Write a protein that binds this DNA or RNA. Structure first.
Ligand code: ATP
Ligand code: ATP
Ligand code: MG
Ligand code: MG
Ligand code: MN
Ligand code: MN
Ligand code: ZN
Ligand code: ZN
Lengths: 348, 356
DNA sequence: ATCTGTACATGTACAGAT
DNA sequence: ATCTGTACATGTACAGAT
DNA sequence: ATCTGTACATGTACAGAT
DNA sequence: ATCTGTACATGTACAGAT
């Protein structure tokens, strides 16, 4: 009852969707164009739209879009970086860049900034670089604020790295045929651009499965008909939206929650969808029970300090090395509070 | 129980499968290489294995393989033959390797199938390691059939197919009604695949005889057979086993046994059985309506349904609704009532023909 | 020297065999 | 319940062509 | 190698019927 | 309240033309 009303608030409006989309489409097409017919090191970069807006789980407003400019590359000798599972060195046009991640992303960002300087019909700037991010982020105002993440990615057509062999455990849910075919797709690398002052950080890329997460979001039933015109609606995505919203409201209020992002909710719910594969475990009439069991799952994750990357099982997103024990214990208290008092944070 | 044991008789043996496939693959490899030589008009033809053996529903013995030699053909052509839904003339706006087979702008099917059969006959002549000859042409068949003695008898239907990548012909807009069973996404993807035309090749005395082609969906049928469930894990190693294919096998076998004994059943063929079960899978989409424990009643309802098709003289092509495979124009009422009685008899006497 | 149609290499579902 | 042959989808090598 | 055309998936929006 | 049917909107895959 309450939760249906929250979801009506979170719904994007069809007019807001078309106004933001045509501006975003304008800038992205023009930037993609500058990469090609202009003989750059990125000639042949291709576009792949990723993230919440294209998965149809964007909440509140259409104000943040995610785009991959992916580039196919051949002699890619990979070499796992110090057992982290998700970070890698790359070895063997691009002779201008070991293939250095910062070196390559710098030229990518120089080109974009240049072309953004030559855009006279939209209010669009390049956000100052965030050490920690693989993105070049645009800030558009038309007039409302829209941020766009342009993510450079290497594309490799080889088999997936050893560290993912036990990942993507969809066999009881989406099945073994879906899994084998998914793993026949390419995989993608992106910059680790964090200034932790640590080791090989500057040449380290990171695995990306944004194309696989997109498929799963739109092929999310054990039944082929789930959420189709001739099937039965489930509420899996509405739980993602509600869990994503509770963390947006908690991050807006407390800076002690700065280390948490939507990807932590996303990974948590991928495990929940695998734990509870049956589409009837997600009946719209049980929206409350499902949201509450997801909350509980996410609290068990904070209590055990354990949230494994859905595709890279040995890479713990909640390790002491990324998030303080106290930050997790903090988030836990605020979730339990919202939980056990009917979610006051939703009414503001 | 009784039906558990028929399926064990019906089950193919790996030794037999291994020996038959070794031979069959060597022959098809050689015929395919020869298609690519010289000014062969069929250079660029590609292989696609279809039929019961590759759908895993081939029963009793591995002795009949079906394989398409498909050839891609562009432009935008096609004219439906007399509102039949299934049959077409193939034209060409472009006026070239198929030029030797045109008649004006109309591509002759029996001209192409002749040159196709000629080349196969030659290459089989020069095979001196396998006992393999070319079966005398059957009217109405698009196939060039090989008979291999292995020393066991083995049939191989080489089917000549045109491949078109355009949208499917409008006579199929309402066909393939899988939206409640396999879903709309599957339907959209399946219909983005090519469609195929094979020679009609009758000598009926009808106008356009040697230039009439017939639609074929063997490739979409292979997908459906191997992806037959509402649940993605159906019959997979972390999902539940169903009994959809086991019903098709038992029914193939009922018709196979009867067609051996009685000549009256010559108008009937396994495609009729296959078509009927696609309707039954559409009527009963849930995997739970095909539980292995209810194999008896699953086979029973398919029987009832096949009987209703025979008596009401109605069995629509799964992909071309307006095409009725059981129309009086195709099979006599006398032929349909005969099989109808033979089916009720088996159904209501403990299935004696299985013990044959 | 590079290009590339052909065929080998790789991985895994399906289902027979044990 | 595990071992295993066949089919098949896609990546990759390279003898022979350019 | 590039780009438009097509079809239908995913949505929002709403009125009528339940 | 919710289910259904139609209108309206964007995203995406791929055939075919240039
Ligand atoms: N830490 C990460 N590791 C791997 N992939 C990530 C990570 N963070 C983000 N991604 C990928 O990039 C996409 C965009 O991330 P972003 O931060 O915009 O979140 P989102 O899923 O788009 O949702 P929202 O923007 O609405 O919070 C994600 O959907 C995911 O595929
Ligand atoms: N009359 C027909 N109309 C349309 N397609 C047909 C027809 N007959 C056969 N086919 C197609 O060609 C394939 C091969 O036909 P075939 O007679 O070998 O049957 P099958 O399904 O392979 O089984 P089996 O050979 O074991 O009886 C079929 O699976 C079907 O896809
Ligand atoms: Mg986003
Ligand atoms: Mg066959
Ligand atoms: Mn982002
Ligand atoms: Mn046949
Ligand atoms: Zn759903
Ligand atoms: Zn099944």
């Amino acid at each position: 009852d309450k939760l249906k009303k929250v979801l009506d608030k979170l719904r994007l409006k069809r007019k807001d969707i078309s106004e933001a989309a045509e501006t975003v489409n304008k800038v992205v097409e023009r930037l993609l164009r500058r990469m090609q017919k202009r003989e750059s090191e990125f000639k042949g970069v291709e576009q792949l739209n990723t993230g919440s807006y294209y998965e149809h789980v964007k909440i509140s407003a259409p104000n943040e879009f995610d785009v991959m400019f992916k580039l196919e590359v051949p002699r890619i000798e990979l070499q796992e970086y110090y057992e982290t599972g998700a970070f890698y060195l790359v070895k063997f046009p691009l002779s201008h860049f070991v293939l250095s991640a910062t070196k390559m992303l710098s030229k990518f960002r120089k080109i974009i900034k240049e072309e953004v300087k030559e855009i006279k019909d939209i209010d669009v700037s390049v956000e100052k670089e965030k050490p920690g991010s693989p993105a070049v982020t645009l800030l558009i105002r038309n007039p409302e604020e829209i941020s766009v993440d342009i993510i450079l990615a290497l594309e490799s057509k080889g088999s997936w790295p050893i560290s993912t062999k036990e990942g993507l455990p969809i066999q009881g849910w989406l099945g073994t045929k879906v899994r084998t075919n998914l793993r026949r797709e390419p995989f993608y690398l992106v910059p680790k651009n964090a200034k932790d002052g640590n080791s090989f950080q500057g040449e380290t890329w990171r695995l990306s499965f944004s194309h696989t997460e997109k498929y799963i979001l739109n092929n999310h039933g054990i039944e082929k008909t789930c959420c189709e015109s001739s099937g039965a609606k489930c509420c899996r995505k509405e739980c993602l939206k509600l869990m994503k919203y509770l963390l947006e409201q908690l991050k807006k209020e407390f800076q002690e929650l700065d280390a948490f992002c939507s990807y932590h909710v996303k990974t948590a719910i991928f495990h929940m969808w695998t734990q509870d594969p049956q589409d009837s475990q997600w009946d719209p009439r049980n929206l409350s029970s499902c949201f509450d069991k997801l909350l509980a799952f996410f609290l068990e994750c904070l209590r055990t300090e354990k949230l494994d990357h859905y595709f890279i099982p040995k890479f713990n997103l909640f390790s002491q090395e990324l998030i303080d024990r106290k930050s997790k214990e903090f988030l836990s208290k605020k979730i339990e509070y919202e939980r056990n008092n009917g979610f006051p944070i939703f009414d503001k």
